[PDB]
Chains A and B, each alone.
Chain A
Amino acid sequence: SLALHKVIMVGSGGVGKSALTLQFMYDEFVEDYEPTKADSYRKKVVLDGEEVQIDILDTAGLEDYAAIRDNYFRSGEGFLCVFSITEMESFAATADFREQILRVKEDENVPFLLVGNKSDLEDKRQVSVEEAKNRAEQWNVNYVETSAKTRANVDKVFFDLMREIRARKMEDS
Chain B
Amino acid sequence: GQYLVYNGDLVEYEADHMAQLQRVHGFLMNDCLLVATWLPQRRGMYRYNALYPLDRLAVVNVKDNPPMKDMFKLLMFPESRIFQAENAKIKREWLEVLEETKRALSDKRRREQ
Contact = CB atoms under 8 A, between A and B. Distances in A.
A78 to B, nearest CB: 15
Interface residues on chain B, size class = 20 to 34
A123 B62 CA distance: 37
A67 B80 CA distance: 14
A37 B63 contact: no
Given A71-B58, A71-B77, A72-B75, A40 B63 contact: yes
Interface string B64-99: 010010000101110010000000000000000001
Contact of B58 (A38, A39, A41, A42): A38
Given A71-B76, A71-B77, A41 B17 contact: no
A43 B73 CA distance: 17
Residue among A37, A38, A42 with the highest chain B CB neighbour number at 10 A: A38
A166 to B, nearest CB: 16
B57 interface: yes
A39 B61 CA distance: 5
Contacts of A40: 60-63, 73
Give the interface SS of chain A, mostly helix, strand, loop or mixed. Answer: mixed
A39 B77 contact: no
A75 B75 contact: yes
B29 interface: no
B12 to A, nearest CB: 16
A73 to B, nearest CB: 10
A68 interface: yes
Interface of B: 16-17, 55-63, 65, 68, 73, 75-77, 80, 99, 106
Interface of A: 1, 4, 37-43, 57, 64-65, 67-68, 70-72, 74-75
17 contacts: A1-B17, A37-B59, A37-B99, A38-B59, A38-B60, A39-B63, A40-B61, A40-B73, A42-B65, A64-B106, A67-B55, A71-B58, A71-B75, A71-B76, A71-B77, A74-B75, A75-B75
